[PDB]
Design a protein around this ligand. Structure first.
Ligand SMILES: c1ccc2oc(CNCCCCCCCNc3c4c(nc5ccccc35)CCCC4)cc2c1
Ligand SMILES: *[C@@H]1O[C@H](CO)[C@@H](O[C@@H]2O[C@H](CO)[C@@H](O)[C@H](O)[C@H]2NC(C)=O)[C@H](O)[C@H]1NC(C)=O
Ligand SMILES: *[C@@H]1O[C@H](CO)[C@@H](O)[C@H](O)[C@H]1NC(C)=O
Ligand SMILES: *[C@H]1O[C@H](CO)[C@@H](O)[C@H](O)[C@H]1NC(C)=O
Length: 534
């Protein structure tokens, strides 16, 4: 080798870069391709594996982020801008990143990060997805993948093979193929790969657990605030088709045959599709899960629920959880009365509307049912209560109760579940109090940022991040987040009978049972039953 930053891989030779890590240093390989650029006539198709290359691929800088809608609701605002692309956007975007410990290890554990963003945005290159503190602190090879989002990734004319749909999931699978085939040269154990991810990354993980074509490519799985059965995470092939033809209609396109339609859509510039993306949604939910995975009979042989009942999925160990206020950012962005700079107390009227916004698929009875469920009628004009109740509505319906359904289903067949509730609101949070513990805001703990002194996290936050990185890495290494026979308090296994989970915050650990049963019984059993009858 005569070098640490040089690696020969079944695709090509790769030149690394040396990086500082809290006064130490590590190796890092940025922007390694794993597939052919999906440009021109390749748009909306299955990816192809990268054609192997003569020479030294300069893997010393982050790659172009994929093409997505950017978030300008708060220009200049870091809380919101941290999530936007920070490298140039381009259809040429299927690369990946490895952080290897230094000195290069023998065959140690690999974690692969799959970003979220609702399947319409996201980027592998964000400050908070910086793999170096975790790769360093826990001695793991940390990969981060990238995948087409939006129409580029999920336009779906089932029957067609030109835009079959799901292709963004296939992007991830191929990144995962590549880890299977090449991570050995980098010091990592291809028999010890944990895929982890948040939001749509969390659901993508769960979809790889489910899909036959992906199960064999990894060992263990972490799902953070996302689950494949989330209502924003998939659509029927009928509704993908319907939505895809509506992108044509919106862009003046021939609609007689798929060939016609795809051809038209392939001619248009990127920002053009992005600009009419919103306008495919029936009406509506706020924000733009236009193009998402399809239940296609291929990647997904049958319906998720049926897969999940029959046990048709990978049986291994999972670690997963939710944040206390998943819903808060949705309300801020899409619902009246809710604004970044006020306490956002909610009139009783703005509650009726907010309910309607959050449960689009429901009839008047559904809305009454949800309203009854979440309303204190001894004090129905409390604007804090109404504001918080709406938050819980949105959080439970879209993240917690689908996640709890998945957990109870998986655990009947799987080989060990661990379940967390992250309810710490960070000291240095730039968002207003009423949002609480926000969708996405445990990521920074997982990826080590509170160990950087520059960023003003408290010491008790430094200890939390260290504890969490350990749980995560110990779990990836062993299928269990606890240390062999250590003094520290044990995070119990989640079981069907007893359903224990822990909080994840600065106070000493507490174990609980049945995370949000009452509401989840409502969302998972009662409400669907009531809508199917009426
Ligand atoms: C209620 C209803 C639907 C929901 O779907 C999801 C899962 N993914 C949604 C992410 C797509 C919206 C992201 C646009 C802004 N990017 C952010 C993202 C996240 N958190 C944010 C918090 C505050 C402001 C912006 C955030 C975390 C996920 C990455 C994108 C969560 C969720 C909650
Ligand atoms: C995970 O699976 C392992 C192995 O597939 C299970 O361990 C076996 O348990 C049976 C009965 O408990 C024993 O007869 C064997 O000695 C164990 N085998 C091994 C290889 O350890 C284990 O119980 C499963 N874990 C969970 C939490 O479901
Ligand atoms: C790798 O690429 C970047 C792009 O500007 C450059 O800064 C860096 O010095 C290059 N290294 C080599 C080996 O050329
Ligand atoms: C704490 O650090 C931040 C960096 O995000 C810095 O901008 C800020 O000025 C510091 N706080 C105070 C009170 O000076």
């Amino acid at each position: 080798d005569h070098s640490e930053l040089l690696v020969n891989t079944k695709s090509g030779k790769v030149m690394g870069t040396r990086v500082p890590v809290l006064s130490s240093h590590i190796s890092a390989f940025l922007g390694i391709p794993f597939a052919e650029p999906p440009v021109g006539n390749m748009r909306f198709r299955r990816p192809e594996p990268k054609k192997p290359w003569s020479g030294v691929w300069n893997a010393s800088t982050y790659p172009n982020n994929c093409q997505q809608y950017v978030d300008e609701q708060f220009p200049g605002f870091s809380g919101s801008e941290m999530w936007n692309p920070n490298r140039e956007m381009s259809e040429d975007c299927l690369y990946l990143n490895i952080w290897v410990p230094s000195p290069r290890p023998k065959s140690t554990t690999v974690m692969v990060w799959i970003y979220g963003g609702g399947f319409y945005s996201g980027s592998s290159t964000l400050d908070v997805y910086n793999g170096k503190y975790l790769a360093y602190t826990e001695e793991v090879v940390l990969v981060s993948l990238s995948y087409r989002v939006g129409a580029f990734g999920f336009l779906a004319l089932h029957g067609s093979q030109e835009a079959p749909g799901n292709v963004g999931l296939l992007d991830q699978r191929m990144a995962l193929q590549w880890v299977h085939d090449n991570i050995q040269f980098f010091g990592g154990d291809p028999k010890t790969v944990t895929i982890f991810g948040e939001s749509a990354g969390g659901a993508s993980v769960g979809m790889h657990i489910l899909s036959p074509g992906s199960r064999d490519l990894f060992r263990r799985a972490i799902l953070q605030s996302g689950s494949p059965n989330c209502p924003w995470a998939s659509v029927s092939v009928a509704e993908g088709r319907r939505r895809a033809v509506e992108l044509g209609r919106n862009l003046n396109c021939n609609l007689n045959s798929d060939e016609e339609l795809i051809h038209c859509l392939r001619e248009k510039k990127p920002q053009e599709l992005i600009d009419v993306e919103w306008n495919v949604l029936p009406f509506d939910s706020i924000f733009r899960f236009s193009f998402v995975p399809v239940i296609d009979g291929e990647f997904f042989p049958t319906s998720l629920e049926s897969m999940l009942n029959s046990g048709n999925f990978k049986k291994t160990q999972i670690l997963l959880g939710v944040n206390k206020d998943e819903g808060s950012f949705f309300l801020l962005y899409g619902a009246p009365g809710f604004s970044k700079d006020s306490e956002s107390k909610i009139s009783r009227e703005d509650f009726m509307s907010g309910v309607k916004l959050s449960v689009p698929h429901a009839n008047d009875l559904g809305l009454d049912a949800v309203t009854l469920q979440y309303t204190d009628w001894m004090d129905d004009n409390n604007g804090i209560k109404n504001r918080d109740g709406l938050d819980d509505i949105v959080g439970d319906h879209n993240v917690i109760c689908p996640l709890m359904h998945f957990v109870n289903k998986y655990t009947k067949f799987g080989n060990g579940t661990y379940l967390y509730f992250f309810n710490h609101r960070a000291s240095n949070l730039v968002w207003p109090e009423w949002m609480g513990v926000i969708h996405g805001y445990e990521i920074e703990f997982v990826f080590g940022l509170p160990l950087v002194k520059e960023l003003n996290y408290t010491a008790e936050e430094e200890a939390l991040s260290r504890r969490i990185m350990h749980y995560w890495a110990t779990f990836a290494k062993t299928g269990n987040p606890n240390e062999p026979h250590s003094q520290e308090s044990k995070w119990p296994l989640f079981t069907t009978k007893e359903q224990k989970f822990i909080d994840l915050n600065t106070e000493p650990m507490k174990v609980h049972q049945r995370l949000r049963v009452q509401m989840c019984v409502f969302w998972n059993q009662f409400l669907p039953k009531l809508l199917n009858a009426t």
